Design an enzyme around this catalytic site. Structure first.
Site, PDB file in Angstrom:
ATOM      1  N   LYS A   1      43.970  57.275  46.369  1.00 32.67           N
ATOM      2  CA  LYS A   1      43.568  58.686  46.377  1.00 32.67           C
ATOM      3  C   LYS A   1      42.552  58.961  47.502  1.00 32.67           C
ATOM      4  CE  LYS A   1      40.549  57.611  42.471  1.00 32.67           C
ATOM      5  NZ  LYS A   1      40.791  56.147  42.597  1.00 32.67           N
TER       6      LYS A   1
ATOM      7  N   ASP B   1      39.597  49.545  47.740  1.00 31.60           N
ATOM      8  CA  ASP B   1      39.942  49.212  46.348  1.00 31.60           C
ATOM      9  C   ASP B   1      41.280  48.489  46.102  1.00 31.60           C
ATOM     10  OD1 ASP B   1      37.488  49.621  45.204  1.00 31.60           O
ATOM     11  OD2 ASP B   1      37.918  51.635  44.406  1.00 31.60           O
TER      12      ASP B   1
ATOM     13  N   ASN C   1      39.392  57.035  48.095  1.00 35.30           N
ATOM     14  CA  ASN C   1      39.629  55.650  48.529  1.00 35.30           C
ATOM     15  C   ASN C   1      39.920  55.507  50.036  1.00 35.30           C
ATOM     16  OD1 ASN C   1      39.317  54.219  46.014  1.00 35.30           O
ATOM     17  ND2 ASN C   1      41.388  54.854  45.425  1.00 35.30           N
TER      18      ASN C   1
HETATM   19  C1  LIG Z   1      38.135  44.130  46.295  1.00 33.45           C
HETATM   20  C2  LIG Z   1      37.210  45.372  46.328  1.00 33.45           C
HETATM   21  O1  LIG Z   1      35.927  44.894  46.784  1.00 33.45           O
HETATM   22  C3  LIG Z   1      35.123  45.916  47.242  1.00 33.45           C
HETATM   23  C4  LIG Z   1      33.919  45.609  47.873  1.00 33.45           C
HETATM   24  C5  LIG Z   1      33.105  46.612  48.355  1.00 33.45           C
HETATM   25  C6  LIG Z   1      33.475  47.935  48.210  1.00 33.45           C
HETATM   26  C7  LIG Z   1      32.673  48.959  48.719  1.00 33.45           C
HETATM   27  C8  LIG Z   1      33.050  50.295  48.585  1.00 33.45           C
HETATM   28  C9  LIG Z   1      32.243  51.320  49.067  1.00 33.45           C
HETATM   29  N1  LIG Z   1      31.769  52.345  48.372  1.00 33.45           N
HETATM   30  N2  LIG Z   1      31.064  53.070  49.088  1.00 33.45           N
HETATM   31  C10 LIG Z   1      30.378  54.295  48.626  1.00 33.45           C
HETATM   32  C11 LIG Z   1      31.387  55.426  48.287  1.00 33.45           C
HETATM   33  C12 LIG Z   1      31.208  56.642  49.212  1.00 33.45           C
HETATM   34  C13 LIG Z   1      29.775  57.200  49.221  1.00 33.45           C
HETATM   35  C14 LIG Z   1      31.663  56.287  50.630  1.00 33.45           C
HETATM   36  N3  LIG Z   1      31.372  55.819  46.852  1.00 33.45           N
HETATM   37  C15 LIG Z   1      32.059  54.796  46.054  1.00 33.45           C
HETATM   38  C16 LIG Z   1      30.008  55.988  46.324  1.00 33.45           C
HETATM   39  C17 LIG Z   1      30.997  52.633  50.334  1.00 33.45           C
HETATM   40  N4  LIG Z   1      30.365  53.102  51.423  1.00 33.45           N
HETATM   41  C18 LIG Z   1      30.459  52.434  52.555  1.00 33.45           C
HETATM   42  N5  LIG Z   1      31.188  51.316  52.654  1.00 33.45           N
HETATM   43  C19 LIG Z   1      31.845  50.804  51.604  1.00 33.45           C
HETATM   44  N6  LIG Z   1      32.541  49.685  51.780  1.00 33.45           N
HETATM   45  C20 LIG Z   1      31.761  51.468  50.376  1.00 33.45           C
HETATM   46  C21 LIG Z   1      34.229  50.586  47.925  1.00 33.45           C
HETATM   47  C22 LIG Z   1      35.045  49.569  47.425  1.00 33.45           C
HETATM   48  C23 LIG Z   1      34.684  48.245  47.579  1.00 33.45           C
HETATM   49  C24 LIG Z   1      35.492  47.250  47.088  1.00 33.45           C
END
Ligand SMILES: CCOc1ccc2cc(-c3nn(C[C@H](C(C)C)N(C)C)c4ncnc(N)c34)ccc2c1
Length: 460
Positions: free
Chosen positions: A134, A153, A137
């Site tokens: 979605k 995700d 994501n």
């Molecule tokens: C196998 C999945 O493992 C992970 C590890 C870190 C993760 C980190 C995020 C993540 N989440 N977020 C915050 C987001 C949004 C503000 C961009 N939401 C969920 C609050 C991030 N912002 C910047 N970089 C990111 N990598 C993220 C989302 C999914 C993730 C899944």
């Protein structure tokens, strides 16, 4: 000998609630590298598979590499949590960047969808299905205007059960493939969701819509949709043909991710195209509505958490106060706050003892009293929690403002129906609550009024 997450990483700040857990910006204590850690609570999330299968999937994802898929670096696990350590991205969510643009054409849509199909194709080759694809994501890699989309995700849905709590569920029904609802799904479900997102990018409206979650689910399940709206007149035939192929009901007849990349529409338009002004307005409206329902739910939730934590923290400290005079020292306050974390998961920001020492110091360096003497814990309790009450009160306020694009100060009764439909608050229940606060029949509420409705909808 088994590695401890907090031995390696400190918390910098919270980045929000994602699927299956909170995300925290962390930093390696030695190398200084910044990471985005998703912390999943074992109590709050049932696993679908065994440990052997989770470990094996993590090992695979650590070695996968593609410019449109989030990089995973490390995996930790202790008694109550999984820690999923990935690369930080700073571009925000795709749709929050799309709403703030003058023009948007099929060429812009095709470049975005090509990135999404590219990341998806790669993962399907590696037999990893998303299931929950979605717009939230889809992150942008940086604040740069040419920035790559990183899909987040992949991997989770396979191993963890989706929440049935509405805070976590909001926004999901538009995107889920029919065959997921019925239990027999495979990689084609990700083409379906991508089709829904494309429909939305080119018209600004979900193809399957309704007044609440279950009515959306009913539309999805029957699988019927049309291109009969006005904005579909401004769109190429080839775009609608792809969408038709991606929103084909029976999965074995649905187009694959890879074959979608070779579609006429993607080929032509990712190489004299009018802007889609009518779609930018509807997506701006759609995003605003979605974002305020979330904030409505999160505000209600943190008020419930506060009620729980305020009473618990007080009780913990009363036990500690052996002499019964109300006097505890910073070290006891830290011990009491630690114990609150020993039996609660809402502060994934309080990863270890030193996150809590600092957070006590912040509370203390507001209440004004000295931290090297004894302290009146009653006072400390009343400020500690508000640093989530005020903090959350302010985050709702901003989404109210964002939603009110005419700066009128008010939300109509029609708009409340829409916000509460998306929030799954029963129509009779919020009207009932509206009556208890709006006694003038304005058919509109201002911020404080709207806030009062939400306090009444979470038992206050
Ligand atoms: C196998 C999945 O493992 C992970 C590890 C870190 C993760 C980190 C995020 C993540 N989440 N977020 C915050 C987001 C949004 C503000 C961009 N939401 C969920 C609050 C991030 N912002 C910047 N970089 C990111 N990598 C993220 C989302 C999914 C993730 C899944």
């Amino acid at each position: 000998s088994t590695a401890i997450f907090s031995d390696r990483y400190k918390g910098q700040r919270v980045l929000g609630k994602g699927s299956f857990g909170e995300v925290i910006l962390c930093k390696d204590k030695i190398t200084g590298q910044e990471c985005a850690v998703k912390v999943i609570s074992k109590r709050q999330v049932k696993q679908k598979t065994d440990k052997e299968s989770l470990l094996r999937e993590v090992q695979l994802l650590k070695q996968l590499d593609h410019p449109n898929i989030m990089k995973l670096y490390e995996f930790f696990e202790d008694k109550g949590y999984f820690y999923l350590v990935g690369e930080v991205y700073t571009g925000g969510e795709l749709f929050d960047e799309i709403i703030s643009r003058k023009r948007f054409s099929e060429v812009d849509a095709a470049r975005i969808i090509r990135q999404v199909l590219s990341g998806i194709t790669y993962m399907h080759k590696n037999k990893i299905v998303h299931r929950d694809l979605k717009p939230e994501n889809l992150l942008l890699e940086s604040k740069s205007k040419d920035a790559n989309i990183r899909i987040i995700d992949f991997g989770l849905s396979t191993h963890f059960e989706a929440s049935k709590k509405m805070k976590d569920k909001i926004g999901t029904a538009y995107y889920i493939a029919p065959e997921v609802l019925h239990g027999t799904y495979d990689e084609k479900c990700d083409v379906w969701s991508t089709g829904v997102i494309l429909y939305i990018l080119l018209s600004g409206c979900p193809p399957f819509n309704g007044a609440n979650e279950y009515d959306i689910l009913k539309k999805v399940e029957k699988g019927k949709y049309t291109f009969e709206l006005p904005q579909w007149k401004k769109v190429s035939e080839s775009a609608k043909d792809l969408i038709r192929k991606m929103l084909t009901y029976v999965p074995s007849m649905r187009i694959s991710a890879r074959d979608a990349l070779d579609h006429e529409w993607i080929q032509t338009y990712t190489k004299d195209v009018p802007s889609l002004d009518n779609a930018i307005l509807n997506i701006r409206q759609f995003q605003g509505t979605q974002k305020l329902a979330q904030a409505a739910l999160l505000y209600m939730g943190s008020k419930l958490t506060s009620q729980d934590e305020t009473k618990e923290l007080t009780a913990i400290f009363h036990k500690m106060d052996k002499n019964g005079d109300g006097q505890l020292d910073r070290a006891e306050l830290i011990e009491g706050y630690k114990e609150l974390m020993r039996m609660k998961g809402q502060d994934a920001s309080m990863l270890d003892a030193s996150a809590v020492e600092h957070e006590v110091d912040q509370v203390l360096d507001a209440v004004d009293f000295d931290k090297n003497g004894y302290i009146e814990y009653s006072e400390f309790v009343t400020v500690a929690m508000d640093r989530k009450t005020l903090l959350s009160r302010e985050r709702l306020e901003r989404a109210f403002r964002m939603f009110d694009s005419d700066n009128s100060g008010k939300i109509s009764s029609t708009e409340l129906a829409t916000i509460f439909g998306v929030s799954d608050v029963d129509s009779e229940t919020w009207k009932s609550v509206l009556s208890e606060v709006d006694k003038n029949n304005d058919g509109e509420v201002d911020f404080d009024e709207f806030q009062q409705m939400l306090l009444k909808l979470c038992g206050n």
